[PDB]
Amino acid sequence: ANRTITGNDGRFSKTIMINEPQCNQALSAKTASELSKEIDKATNAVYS
Amino acid sequence: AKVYGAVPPLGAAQGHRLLHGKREREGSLFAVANDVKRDERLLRQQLNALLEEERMPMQARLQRNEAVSSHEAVPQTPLVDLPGVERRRDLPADPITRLFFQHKGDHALYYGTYDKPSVQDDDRVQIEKRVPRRREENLYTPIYDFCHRIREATEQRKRFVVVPSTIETRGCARVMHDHGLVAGFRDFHNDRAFAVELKYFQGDSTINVIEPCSYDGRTEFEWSPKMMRRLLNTHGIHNRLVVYICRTADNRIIDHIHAVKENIGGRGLMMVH
Amino acid sequence: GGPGSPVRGPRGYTAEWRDLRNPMRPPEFPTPWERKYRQYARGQHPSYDMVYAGPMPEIFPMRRDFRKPTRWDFHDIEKQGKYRTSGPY
Amino acid sequence: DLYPEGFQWKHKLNTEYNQWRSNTWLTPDLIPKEHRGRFLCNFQLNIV
Amino acid sequence: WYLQNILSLELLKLKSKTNAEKIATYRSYMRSLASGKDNTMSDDDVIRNIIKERWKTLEFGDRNAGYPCTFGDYIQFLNEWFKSLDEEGMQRLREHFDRRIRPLLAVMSPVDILWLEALTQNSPHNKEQLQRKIAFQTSLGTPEFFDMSKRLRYEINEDYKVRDELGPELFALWSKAPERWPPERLSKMYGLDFTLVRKILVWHHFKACYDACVEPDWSLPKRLFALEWIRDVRARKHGLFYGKMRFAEQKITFYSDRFLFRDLVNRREASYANVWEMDDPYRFLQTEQDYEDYWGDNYDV
Amino acid sequence: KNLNSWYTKGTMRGGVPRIYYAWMRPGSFTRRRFEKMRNP
Amino acid sequence: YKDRLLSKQFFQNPQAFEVVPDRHERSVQFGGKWEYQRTHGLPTVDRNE
Amino acid sequence: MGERMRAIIEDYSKGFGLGPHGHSPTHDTIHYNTLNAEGERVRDLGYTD
Amino acid sequence: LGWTDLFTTIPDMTYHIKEWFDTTEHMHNDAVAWQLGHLLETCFKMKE
Amino acid sequence: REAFSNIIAVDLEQEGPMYPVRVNADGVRVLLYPARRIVANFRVADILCAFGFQHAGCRINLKATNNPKSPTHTVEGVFEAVKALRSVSEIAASRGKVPHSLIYNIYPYLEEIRRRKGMMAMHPPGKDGLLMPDRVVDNRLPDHLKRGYYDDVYWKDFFAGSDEHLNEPRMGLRGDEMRRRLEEAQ
Amino acid sequence: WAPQMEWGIENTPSQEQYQEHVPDTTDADFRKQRRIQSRPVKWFYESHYT
Amino acid sequence: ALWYRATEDPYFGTPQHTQRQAEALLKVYVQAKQRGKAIDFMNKLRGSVEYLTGDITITTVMQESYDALLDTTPHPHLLTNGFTLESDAAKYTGEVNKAPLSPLQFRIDMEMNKYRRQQKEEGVVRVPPALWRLDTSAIVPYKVD
Amino acid sequence: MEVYRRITERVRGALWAHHGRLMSERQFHRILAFVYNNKYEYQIRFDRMEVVGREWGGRVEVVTTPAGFLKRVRVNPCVEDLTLYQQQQLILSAYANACADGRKLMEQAEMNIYKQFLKDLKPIVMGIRDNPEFYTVSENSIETIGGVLQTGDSNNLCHTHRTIPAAKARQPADEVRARQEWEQKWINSPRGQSWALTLRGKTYFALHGPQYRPRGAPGAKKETLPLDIPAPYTAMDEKRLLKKNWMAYLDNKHVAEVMWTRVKIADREKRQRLLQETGRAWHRPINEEAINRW
Amino acid sequence: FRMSGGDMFVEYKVLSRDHRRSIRVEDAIVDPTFKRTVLPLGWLELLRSPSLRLPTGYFVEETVHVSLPNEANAIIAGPVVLYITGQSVPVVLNPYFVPEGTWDMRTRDGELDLRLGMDAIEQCTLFSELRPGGLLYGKLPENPNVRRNESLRATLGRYGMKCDLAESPLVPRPWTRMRYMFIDELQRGPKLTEFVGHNPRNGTPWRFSQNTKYFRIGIWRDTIRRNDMNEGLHAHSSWQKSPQQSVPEVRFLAPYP
Ligand SMILES: [Mg+2]
Ligand SMILES: [Mg+2]
C-alpha cells in the first residue's frame, strides 16, 4: 500500500524488488513485516 | 464422570421458566398484547442479526478479529513520528533505458491534462489526440484507440505499446493485468501516454480479441447488473473466461465479476479475452 | 435491499469502547464454545471447500447393461417397415 | 496439461495396435506417412 | 462328470518326479540363482492346468457314443443349479462372471464366432462360408494375435496387484479400533495418487469385512470421499440433475497463482490438542448447511 | 439460480453416438513418464 | 473377544454355523434400512489396553 | 520391429552410477569414453599378472 | 569463505531468469530440479 | 488422403466452445458459439457431431441465403472455425493462472501441511540420511573355500551350476547334471 | 434422491411421445422396452423421504 | 417395503416394531412358501433390540407356523417333510419304493469333501489314525407314510 | 519423510547395484509407512502429558502439550499493568521456552525411532553385504571398460576390510541360538535357579519370556530367529515382473538405477562440501582435466 | 470405551445442533437400565445456540416427571448431538435435563456420575454389545427373552448353532466370498464411454446393431470390398471392419490389445 515493495511475475518465476532509494534501502518495521509477507506468499505460491 | 468446559458443576440455582413455573400473572389485554409484540420483534431482530453475521464478507471478518486483537483499555493517542515516513514512494524505473521518465509525485503542480499536456519527455515523440475530420465520421474516444493500439500491437507481436493515458484507460490496464491478459503496465505520470507490456504464449498472443464497447463518445451504454450476470453464465456453467470492463457511479474501473458481486450497474468500456 | 434501495445514512472515548474486550482476557460468562467454531468464526480455520474435491469415483461397478432389444434390431428387414416402424422406439 | 502423455504401451508394435483397433489399417494408400501406424479409432467417410 | 473330473482330487494322478528332478526342483525353490530354467512350475499351477484342459476336452452329444453328456443333460443340471442359488451364491456367480466372461464380452470379434461355437460344439448356419472368411482373415495376423485366451494378458501399474491387496494391510489393527485409524495412516502405504489410494482403502475395508463374516460400513465410501460427496450434492442442487458431476460442468474461474495463501498460513499454523482432533472425519463441516448436505442420505441421522 | 438443467442438455441425433469423458481426457490419464522417471 | 466376535458373526448369518446349511437369503432388518450403522465392523478392544 | 528392438537394448545396456570423472554416463556437458579412448587404453595395457 | 556457491557477471540477470522460466513447462520436481539446476550451472557457477 | 493430412482434433474436456469464435474462411463468415444443445444446419451439425461436441452451436453467413454458399464453403467454414477454437486449459495457462478445475490436486499437499505439526515434522538429531563410504569391503573367496561354506546354513554343494557365483561353474555337480549341459549343447 | 421427471418414456402419454395412438396394455410394451408391469399405487410401497 | 415404512413414517409410524407387525410379516413369509426369508427373519428378530427388551416375543403360533412351512417346502441339500415320492423315478433311481437320497451316503460324501477341502487349502492331508472309525450309529434312514 | 527416505533409497538402489535384485514398490513404501506410523504412535502418547514453560520469575506460566499446543496461561497481576505489546511478547516467550522443553523430549523420542528403523533395515542391509559375493573398490580408482584400475599412491593406505569369516559360515542365526543356549544353561544351573527367584530374575522373565504370555496378550508369543534375506540368493521382484510384462521390468530397473545414481550424487556433494570446509578444495573448478580429459 | 468393575466407560462430546457449543464428558457409565439419557439441568442453557432454523435453541422443550433416575420434575430437551469416542456416527439424543433437587449426582468430588441410556445405545456400534455374548448383556433388565446365566454357545446352540464357523464342507468359507476386486486404474484401464440419446445420462451406452435398416447396404459394401473405404451410416453401428467391435466397456487404454 506504501509502494515500498514492488514485483514482477512471469509464468513460473517471481521477482520481489525492494524499493526505498531515499534512505538507502533501510527497511522500517512495517516494511520488513510486510516483506516477510510478500516473500512467503511469493514462495508458497503454486507456480513459483 | 469428569466434565470439561462445563464450569462449576450443576451450574448455579437456575430453574427453567416452565419447571419453576411461578403463577402466571394475569395482564390486561394491554400487557399481554405488548408482551407478544415486543418479543415478536425481539425474535425478528435476532433473525436479522444472524442473517447479517452469515452474510458478512471475509475481509470484514478479518478486520474485525484483528481489531479486537489489538484492542487496549484506554484509547491511546498517536505517537509523533519522523518528518514523514508516509509519502507514497515513487515507483522505480530506470533513467537510462526508458519508455518515459518516472515523474515524481512531488512535482504534482507542474502537470497538465490529457488535453493540454505540460512539456515533458521531450526525447520521445508525443502521441496525438485522435479527432474526426468531418461530421459523418465517428467521434473517437481514448478507450477506442486504446483498444485498437493494443490489438494492432498484439498482431505485430510487439513487447511494448505506448498508449493514451486517461482515468478509465489505465483503469482498464490494471484490470487486464489483474486477469493476466497483459504482462505489465506503468503510468509514468506522463500527461499524454503511458505504457503497456504485452504477453505472448505458445507463439500467439494472450489476447484473442479486444473490442471497445462504443464507437462514439456520443453513445453511452449502460450495463444492468442482470446483464453483467448473464455474461457470467454459459448455459448453467459459471464462465469468467471473457472479461468486461466498466465504470461505476463511484468512478471505479471494475470487471463485470466484482460488479456482479456487489450488484452495482456500470457503464460499458470494453471486452477482452 | 441492495444498491438501488434508499440510502441508510450515517478527543476521549465513547460508550462503544467499553463493551469491547481483548480476546486475551477471559470473558464474561464462560460459555463453552466449541474450539472448531471459534476457529471458523475468526476466519483462521483451514478451509475445506468444494474446490478441493476431485472426481467422485465409481467404487462398486454396477452391472453389465445387456443389450435391450429395440425395434431397429430385427433379423428380418421386413419387421422394420415404413408402414409399421417409424423408429427404434 | 497442455501436452498430455497419451498412449504409452509398447507391448505390441504401432502397426499391431493400429491393425486391431482401427479400420484405417485396411486402407494403407489413403493415409499419409506421419499418421500411418498412429491411429487407434474407426473413421466414417462422408462424401459431401 | 463334474463329480469325477473336477471335484474329485483324490483320483487325480500326477506324473511322479525322479530323484534328480526332486533335487533340482527343491534347490530351485529354496534359493534362486539367475539364468535358471524359468518354468519350475508349481504342481498347483500344473494341477489347475489339467483341470482347465479337462474343461476344454469336455464335449457333449449322444452318450451311447463316446462323450459323457447330452447337451440337454448339461443345461438341465445348469438350470436345477441356477434356481438353487442363495444370495451369496448368485453373488459369487456374478463376481465370477464379471471377472472372466465380461472382459471377453468386450474383446470379441466376428473372427472368433466359429471358435466361439466350438466351446459347445454347436453347428452354425453358414459354417462353410465362415470357415473360408475366418481362414482368410486369421491369415492376416499371428496365430497368437488372434486367440481369445491371451487377449487379456497385460495390466497397467504392475507394482500393486489386485491379488496382493486381497489380504488387507494391517487388518489386525484397524479392526480393533477403527477410529484411531483414519485414512491417512494407511494412505502412506501406497505410492499412488489420492483418489486411487482412497478407492483402494474402501476395497480393503470391504474385503476385510466379508472375510470376517460381518457386515461392512456402507457409510465408509461417503466418509473417505466426503469432500467429493458434498461437492456432488451441491452440484446436483445447482445444475439440476441426478448423477455424479463430471469435468465439463466445472466452473471456469481462473485463480491467481498465490490464491491459496490464506488457507496455507491457516493450515501451517494450526494446532491440535490430540491427534483425533487433527483428523476426525467431520472437520469438513461447519455450518448447518454442511451437516444437512452430508447427512441427507440416512433418514435415521 | 441456473434454471437450465445439466440433466437435459443436448440433441438426439438418432443413431449417431458420441464419446464423453467421465473425468479428464484419456490422454492425460496414465502419467507414468513422471511416475517411473522416464524423462530427459 | 472371541465371543463378541462369535456372536456378531452368528447374527450376520446363522447358516454359516449349521452342519447342514439351510437356504440363506437376506430378509428385512429390525434397526431400519440403515441398521448397518449399529452393527458393522469387528468387536472393538478397550482403548486403555 | 527394429526400433523397439533398439529401445529395449539401449535401455537395458545403459550404465548408471558415477564414473571416474564423478558424473553420470548421461550427464549433460561432460563425457566419458570419447572416441573409444578407454577402448584403446585397454588395447595397449591388457590384463595380465 | 564458502558463504555462497553462486556468482555471476551477466547484465540484468533478473530478466533472463524470468524469460528462462517462461519457456519451462512442467511442475514435477524432476523438471523443477533440472531447470533450476541448469540455470545455476550455466550462469551462477563459474565453470568458464 | 488430403483429409487425413489435415486432421484436427478437439479437447472434449469442455464439450463445446466456452466463448464465441468468430472466424472467416474465404468469403464465408462463421460463428461458433456455446449452446444448450447442438444447433446447426444438418451438414454442419453432423460435422460437429463428428468431433463429439454436445453443447456447440454454429451458424454460417448470417442469413442462410447469403453468398457465397457452396457445399465446399459449408464444410471448410466449420472446420476452419473449429481449428481456431482455444481449449479452456490452454487459455488458463496462457494467462499464467490456475484453473478452478485443477485445484483439487493441491489438496493432499495442503493436507499434510496441516498435519505436519508435532512428531511428523521432527527429524532425527545428528542424522542427515547421507552416509558417505569410508572403507573398502570385499568378501569374495577362492572357490575351494566356498565349496562347503554354506553346507550348514543350506544343503551341501550350494553353488553348483551357478555361473556368476563361481569361477568353476561345473564343480560339485554330479555327473548327470554335467551331462545335461553338453546334452543341450549338441 | 432423484425427483420424478416429466416427458419420460413411461410418463408421456402416446400422442406426444409417438405421433400414433399406442395401446396402453399393462403387458409387454415393445416400444417402451418393458416386459411386464405390476401397477401398484405409486407412492404407497416406497418410502416417503424418497 | 411396508415393514420399513412402518418405522420410517413420521405420521403413522411406531417408534419400535410392534409384535403385530412381526407376526404379520412372518405370516406373509409362510403364505408365500418363502423359506430363506422366513429363516433369516426369525433369526434377525431374535437378534433385535425389541426382542432383548422383551417387547416382541416369539409365540407358539409363530413358532409352529414357522415349523410348518419349514417342513413343507424344498430344502437345498436334503429331502423334506412334504416331498412326494414318484413311482416312475425308478427309471433312473432304480427303485420304486424308497426315497432318492441316502443320508448315510450323504454323510460319507461329507467326510470325503472334508478331506478334499483340507487338501485344496493346505496342499497336504494328515492321514487319520488307525483307531479312527466313522460313527454311523446316529444315522437313521428316511421313513415314508 | 526426508532422513528416512534417503536411507531407504540408499537401500533399494544398493540392492539393485550390487546384485540383480529389485525391491517391490509395495515393499519400499511399506517400510516408510512403518516409520510414519511409529511417529504417529509416539504422538498419540505424547498428547496425554503436558510441558510447562515459564517466563519472568515464575510470574508468567504457560502449559502446553509437547506438540506445541497451548492449554493454560497463568499470569501475575503485575503483568496486567504493562502494555498490550509487552504482555504479548512475554506470553509468547514463555510459550517458546515451553516448546523448547517439549521439542527436547520429542527429539529424544525421534532418536529412538531412528534406532528402531535401523534395526528393522538391518536384515536387508546386512543381507546384501554379508554374502561371499559382495565387494567394493575405492572411490578414487579409475574405471575402464574391462575392469577397474589400481589406485597408485601410498600402498600402505589401502586396506581391504572383510565382514565375513572366510572359513565355514557363522551366520547371525547361530549367534541367537547360542544366546538362548546360554540362557538355558544359566537358568538350569544351581546358581541360576537361585537367581530366578530374585527380583532381577523375574524382571528378566517378565520382559524377555514370550513363551509364558497368556493367550490373547499383546506381543510375540515365541522367540524369533533373526530374519535371513540373503540378497543374491533370494529372487524378489524381478522374477515376477520378468514373467509378466517386460515393460514394467524395464521401468522398475530404471527406477532403481536412477535412485542409486541420485544417492551417489548426494554422497559426492557431501564429500565436496566437507572437502571445501577443510580447505583442500577450491570454490570453483580449478582442475578441468579431471573432467574434460575423458 | 474401557472396562472396569464390570462396566463400560466411554468419553463423549455433547453438542448443540449447529455445533456451536460443546461439552466433553470423560468417564460415563454405559448403562442400559435408562430408557433415556440424563443430564444436569444447568447444561440446558449452556447448550442453547439459537440458529436460523431453530430461532429458540431447541426444537423440543417440555416438562416430564422423569422419576426413573431417582408432577414435572424435569425437562425433555432436543435435539442435542452426541459424539462417542469409538463411533463414526453421531447419536442424537432428546435427553432428560434434571435440576439438583430432583436428582443430585455430585457423587464423588469433581465427579458428576453421568451415564448413557438406551437412547444412545440403539444408535451406535455399542448396540451390538447388547446382544448375547456382548459386554452389556449382563446388565439387561430381566426378561422372558433373555436368559441370565447361560453359556454363550449354549444360547446360540438353542438358536440353531451347531458347529464352528464354516466348519462343515457344505458351507463355503467366508473369505472366498470376495476374490477379485475391480479397480480400473490398477488393471486394464478406464471404459470407453459413448451414448446414443440426448445426454450421457439420458441415452443408452449401446449403439445400434447390424440389423438396422440403414446399416445393411453399408455393411454389405464393407464385406465385399473390404480394403477400400466406404461411405455410409454403417460406421455408427456396433459392428465394424476392425477386429475391435464397438460395444460398451471397451477398455481402450489397456496395453493389450
Ligand atoms: Mg482466510
Ligand atoms: Mg440468391
CSV table of C-alpha atoms in Angstrom, one decimal, chain E residues 65-202:
chain,number,residue,atom,x,y,z
E,65,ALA,CA,-21.4,-92.8,-28.4
E,66,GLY,CA,-18.2,-91.5,-26.8
E,67,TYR,CA,-19.0,-88.3,-24.9
E,68,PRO,CA,-20.4,-88.2,-21.3
E,69,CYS,CA,-23.3,-85.8,-21.6
E,70,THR,CA,-26.3,-84.9,-23.7
E,71,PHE,CA,-26.4,-81.1,-24.2
E,72,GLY,CA,-29.9,-81.2,-22.8
E,73,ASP,CA,-28.5,-83.1,-19.8
E,74,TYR,CA,-25.9,-80.3,-19.2
E,75,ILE,CA,-28.3,-77.4,-19.3
E,76,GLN,CA,-30.7,-79.4,-17.2
E,77,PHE,CA,-28.1,-79.6,-14.4
E,78,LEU,CA,-27.3,-76.0,-15.0
E,79,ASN,CA,-31.0,-75.0,-14.7
E,80,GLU,CA,-31.5,-77.0,-11.5
E,81,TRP,CA,-28.4,-75.3,-10.1
E,82,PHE,CA,-29.3,-71.7,-11.1
E,83,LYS,CA,-32.7,-71.9,-9.4
E,84,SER,CA,-30.9,-73.4,-6.4
E,85,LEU,CA,-28.8,-70.3,-5.7
E,86,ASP,CA,-28.8,-68.3,-2.4
E,87,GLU,CA,-28.0,-64.6,-2.1
E,88,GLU,CA,-24.2,-65.0,-1.7
E,89,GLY,CA,-24.4,-68.0,-4.1
E,90,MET,CA,-25.5,-65.9,-7.0
E,91,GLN,CA,-23.2,-63.1,-5.8
E,92,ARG,CA,-20.2,-65.5,-6.2
E,93,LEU,CA,-21.7,-66.3,-9.6
E,94,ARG,CA,-21.9,-62.7,-10.7
E,95,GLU,CA,-18.4,-62.0,-9.5
E,96,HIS,CA,-17.2,-65.0,-11.4
E,97,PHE,CA,-19.0,-63.6,-14.4
E,98,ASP,CA,-17.6,-60.1,-14.1
E,99,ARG,CA,-14.1,-61.4,-13.8
E,100,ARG,CA,-14.0,-64.0,-16.6
E,101,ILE,CA,-16.8,-63.6,-19.1
E,102,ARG,CA,-17.4,-59.8,-19.1
E,103,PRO,CA,-14.0,-58.6,-20.3
E,104,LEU,CA,-14.2,-61.3,-23.1
E,105,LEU,CA,-17.6,-59.9,-24.0
E,106,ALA,CA,-15.8,-56.6,-24.7
E,107,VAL,CA,-12.9,-58.1,-26.7
E,108,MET,CA,-14.8,-60.4,-29.0
E,109,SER,CA,-14.9,-60.2,-32.8
E,110,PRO,CA,-16.6,-61.9,-35.8
E,111,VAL,CA,-13.2,-63.6,-36.4
E,112,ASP,CA,-14.0,-65.7,-33.3
E,113,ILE,CA,-17.5,-66.9,-33.9
E,114,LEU,CA,-16.5,-70.3,-35.2
E,115,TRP,CA,-14.2,-70.8,-32.2
E,116,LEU,CA,-16.9,-69.3,-30.1
E,117,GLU,CA,-19.2,-72.1,-31.1
E,118,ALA,CA,-16.5,-74.7,-30.7
E,119,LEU,CA,-17.0,-74.4,-26.9
E,120,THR,CA,-20.3,-76.2,-27.0
E,121,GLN,CA,-19.7,-78.0,-30.3
E,122,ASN,CA,-22.8,-76.4,-31.8
E,123,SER,CA,-23.1,-76.3,-35.6
E,124,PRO,CA,-23.6,-72.8,-37.3
E,125,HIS,CA,-25.8,-72.0,-40.3
E,126,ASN,CA,-23.1,-70.7,-42.6
E,127,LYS,CA,-20.4,-73.0,-41.3
E,128,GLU,CA,-18.5,-73.5,-44.7
E,129,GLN,CA,-18.6,-69.8,-45.6
E,130,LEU,CA,-17.5,-68.8,-42.1
E,131,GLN,CA,-14.7,-71.4,-42.4
E,132,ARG,CA,-13.5,-69.6,-45.6
E,133,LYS,CA,-14.0,-66.0,-44.3
E,134,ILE,CA,-12.3,-66.6,-41.0
E,135,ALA,CA,-9.5,-68.5,-42.6
E,136,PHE,CA,-8.7,-65.6,-44.9
E,137,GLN,CA,-8.9,-63.1,-42.1
E,138,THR,CA,-6.9,-65.0,-39.5
E,139,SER,CA,-4.4,-65.3,-42.3
E,140,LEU,CA,-3.6,-61.6,-41.8
E,141,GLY,CA,-2.1,-62.0,-38.3
E,142,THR,CA,-0.1,-64.1,-35.9
E,143,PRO,CA,-1.9,-67.1,-34.5
E,144,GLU,CA,-1.1,-65.7,-31.0
E,145,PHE,CA,-2.6,-62.4,-32.1
E,146,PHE,CA,-6.0,-64.0,-32.7
E,147,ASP,CA,-6.7,-66.5,-29.9
E,148,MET,CA,-9.0,-65.1,-27.2
E,149,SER,CA,-7.2,-66.8,-24.3
E,150,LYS,CA,-4.3,-64.4,-24.5
E,151,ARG,CA,-6.2,-61.1,-25.2
E,152,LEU,CA,-6.4,-60.0,-21.5
E,153,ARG,CA,-2.8,-60.8,-20.6
E,154,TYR,CA,-1.2,-57.4,-19.6
E,155,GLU,CA,-2.3,-54.9,-16.9
E,156,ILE,CA,-1.1,-51.4,-16.3
E,157,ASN,CA,0.5,-50.4,-13.0
E,158,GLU,CA,2.2,-53.8,-12.1
E,159,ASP,CA,3.6,-52.5,-8.8
E,160,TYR,CA,0.3,-53.1,-7.0
E,161,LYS,CA,-1.5,-56.2,-7.9
E,162,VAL,CA,-5.1,-57.0,-7.0
E,163,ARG,CA,-4.0,-60.4,-5.9
E,164,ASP,CA,-1.7,-58.9,-3.3
E,165,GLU,CA,-4.3,-56.5,-2.0
E,166,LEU,CA,-6.7,-59.3,-1.1
E,167,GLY,CA,-5.0,-59.6,2.2
E,168,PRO,CA,-5.8,-56.2,3.6
E,169,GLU,CA,-3.0,-54.4,5.2
E,170,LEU,CA,-2.7,-54.0,8.9
E,171,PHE,CA,-6.1,-55.6,9.3
E,172,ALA,CA,-5.1,-56.9,12.8
E,173,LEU,CA,-5.0,-53.3,13.9
E,174,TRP,CA,-7.7,-51.0,12.4
E,175,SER,CA,-10.2,-53.8,13.0
E,176,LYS,CA,-9.8,-53.4,16.7
E,177,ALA,CA,-10.1,-49.6,16.9
E,178,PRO,CA,-11.1,-48.2,13.6
E,179,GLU,CA,-11.4,-44.6,14.9
E,180,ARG,CA,-7.7,-44.4,15.7
E,181,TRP,CA,-7.0,-45.3,12.1
E,182,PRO,CA,-8.1,-42.5,9.8
E,183,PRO,CA,-7.4,-43.0,6.0
E,184,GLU,CA,-4.0,-41.1,6.3
E,185,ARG,CA,-2.1,-43.6,8.4
E,186,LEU,CA,-2.9,-46.3,5.8
E,187,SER,CA,-2.6,-44.0,2.8
E,188,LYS,CA,1.2,-43.6,3.5
E,189,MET,CA,1.4,-47.2,2.3
E,190,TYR,CA,0.7,-46.7,-1.4
E,191,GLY,CA,2.7,-44.8,-3.9
E,192,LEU,CA,-0.4,-43.8,-5.9
E,193,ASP,CA,-2.4,-40.6,-6.2
E,194,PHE,CA,-5.1,-39.6,-3.8
E,195,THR,CA,-8.3,-40.8,-5.5
E,196,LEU,CA,-6.8,-44.2,-6.3
E,197,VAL,CA,-5.5,-44.9,-2.8
E,198,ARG,CA,-8.8,-43.9,-1.1
E,199,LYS,CA,-10.6,-46.1,-3.6
E,200,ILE,CA,-8.2,-49.0,-2.6
E,201,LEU,CA,-8.8,-48.4,1.1
E,202,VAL,CA,-12.5,-48.7,0.6
